[PDB]
């Protein structure tokens, strides 16, 4: 797997800091108790939110809610294949399009998408994060963001802790190598979460989930300096601030998958009704 790599990278700097350093910062004046406490608190936040994001519900929709006919081994009719264009309010000047996912057999709500790995249709699909090992949907986007933020903050606090420790030891760097190791590891795991957080801020600044961005990239294959703004956003709200607020802080809403009684209680939402 790949989530164990990140779990080891999250639990390793705690051990290396609680075996070697979190005793010469309590009562040595090589550091600050406030800084030790803050580091442990932010590390607990990061680990708990990573476990939460890795075992949470992305917002999957039930299956086979829209069946059509029991003939030809549950064959899909013709009119279900092509797109369907429906009008929006009198204000929004652009109509909307809607499609029929032939795997789950539901009429996809707007902004939903299909994951080819888990084989479910997530509600507001962002991407299938391999590290967390889950689809980042609508009901755990806030947890994903809390994970990135906690990682950034824990790395910065461990960095300043190790820096104030290495700067105040008199015997020279020849008596604290573990502090330098922790400093390097913090400086290395401070980059990628910061890059991901800034990418997500710039995305959500134009009401664009990562899937939508990589789709609208079109024929240009530059995923860095593409003009993040477009003129045909139905889901636009007016400004960068409001766009961020409506994409990141979105309400979770009820959970549609639950109460699995496989002994023939609540069926047709678990039967593999694929054409084969």
């Amino acid at each position: 797997p790949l989530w164990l790599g990140v779990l080891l990278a999250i639990v390793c700097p705690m051990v290396l800091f609680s075996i070697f350093e979190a005793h010469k910062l309590w009562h040595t004046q090589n550091g600050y108790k406030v800084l030790v406490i803050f580091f442990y608190y932010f590390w607990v936040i990061t680990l708990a939110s990573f476990i939460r994001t890795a075992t949470s519900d992305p917002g999957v929709l039930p299956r086979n809610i829209h069946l059509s006919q029991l003939r030809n081994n549950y064959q899909i009719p013709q009119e279900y294949y092509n797109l369907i264009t429906l009008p929006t309010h009198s204000s929004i000047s652009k109509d909307i399009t809607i499609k029929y996912c032939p795997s789950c057999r539901i009429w996809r709500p707007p902004r939903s998408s299909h994951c080819s790995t888990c084989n479910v249709c997530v509600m507001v699909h962002d991407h299938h994060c391999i590290w967390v090992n889950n689809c980042i949907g609508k009901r755990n986007y806030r947890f994903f963001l809390i994970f990135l933020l906690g990682a950034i903050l824990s790395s910065v606090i461990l960095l300043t802790n190790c820096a104030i420790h290495i700067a105040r030891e008199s015997g020279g760097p020849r008596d604290c190598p573990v502090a330098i190791l922790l400093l390097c590891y913090a400086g290395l795991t401070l980059w990628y979460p910061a890059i991901l957080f800034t990418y997500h801020i710039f995305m959500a600044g134009n009401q664009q989930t990562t899937r939508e961005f990589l789709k609208g990239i079109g024929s240009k294959k530059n995923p860095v300096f593409h003009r993040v703004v477009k003129e045909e956003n139905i889901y636009n709200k007016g400004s960068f601030l409001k766009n961020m607020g409506h994409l990141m802080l979105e309400p979770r809403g009820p959970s549609f998958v639950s109460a699995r009684k496989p002994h023939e209680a609540g069926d047709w939402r678990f039967m593999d009704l694929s054409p084969a």
Binding site: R52, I65, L70, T88, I98, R142, I146, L149
Partner: protein, 222 residues
Amino acid sequence: ERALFFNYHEFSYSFYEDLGSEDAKPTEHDEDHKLCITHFPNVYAARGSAEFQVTRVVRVPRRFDESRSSLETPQFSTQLPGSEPAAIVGDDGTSFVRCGRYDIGDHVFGCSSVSPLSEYLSAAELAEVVHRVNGFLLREEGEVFGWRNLSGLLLDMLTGGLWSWVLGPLLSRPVFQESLALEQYVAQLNSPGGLLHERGVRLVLPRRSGCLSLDFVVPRPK
């Protein structure tokens, strides 16, 4: 220039068997006598049971041209299927008349876009029920910058991920009142003494049916 909304669940077919003659065979007919599928197999029942042979489902679709919030939060159409601005109109008008036969089970369908739900509910009653369930869904999901969601998110961000997971459910009872409110409303419309109950139509919670269509399980029409 605006595209007109229509019941996008219904699909049509031309090879079918007319009614009135026991020896009807599948032939091609004029478009004015084209078959239109309106009631669908009961997904909410186990195969081979009795209610699967007794009942058919009728879906009130999802709409988008009614409110400013119809894109973020689900909102369902408040019209009887068959009165949409881009629905097929027949000669019978607004009632449901058996016209032909189609898929296994020898189910009867009418050659218009009208729905057998018209045999039980009326426009005003359907509008009232759908409006109430719309309001319940809206106040359940809530607003972005409202205290429910913002307090939830703030304490969640404070305790990492734990308050919504383990620590929260232990402490507060009455913050979950809207889910049980919608459940009670639907169960009361369904229960004896209710509008839907008396007429022979059962409703299902939009929580079960993925909140992507408002389903009415009706008796299998004949």
